[PDB]
Design a protein that fits this description.
Organism (chain B): Mycolicibacterium smegmatis (strain ATCC 700084 / mc(2)155)
Shape of chain B: elongated
Order of helices and strands of chain A: HHH
Radius of gyration of chain B: 20 Å
Protein name (chain A): Virulence factor Mce family protein
PDB class: membrane protein
Largest interface: A-B, 14 and 12 residues
Helix content of chain B: over 70%
Distance between the termini of chain B: 60 Å
Keywords: ABC transporter, Virulence factor, Lipid transport
Strand content of chain B: under 5%
Number of strands of chain A: 0
Largest sheet of chain B: none
Number of helices of chain A: 3
Number of strands of chain B: 0
Protein name (chain B): MCE-family protein MCE1c
Oligomer: part of a larger assembly
Order of helices and strands of chain B: HHH
Chain lengths: ~50, ~50
């Protein structure tokens, strides 16, 4: 457990700045999509129809 | 007298506790550098998680 958690944690730390940026970017993207989810879903349904 | 009776009572249940604590402590004590590096990496990752 200690060995493999060390491996995973150092891999995560190596990309720590990207790992911190991606959470905020994903949150912003998801919030922006949620603010218009209803038109998005309506439009996807209309495209399929 | 109190110390004598306490040592008399809790003596037969001592060697097992000593052996168990010795084994569990040696489980971590022979991995000191690994544990400290794990704690440092966990500090970095968990600080990133908590801030966001």
């Amino acid at each position: 457990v200690i060995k493999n958690l060390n491996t995973v944690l150092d891999t995560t730390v190596r990309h720590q700045k990207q790992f911190d940026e991606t959470l905020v970017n994903f949150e912003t993207l998801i919030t922006g999509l949620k603010n218009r989810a209803d038109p998005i879903a309506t439009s996807v349904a209309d495209i399929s129809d | 007298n109190v110390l004598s009776e306490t040592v008399d009572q809790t003596s037969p249940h001592l060697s097992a506790a000593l052996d168990g604590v010795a084994r569990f402590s040696e489980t971590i004590g022979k991995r000191d550098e690994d544990v400290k590096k794990l704690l440092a990496s966990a500090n970095k990752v968990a600080t990133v998680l908590g801030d966001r």
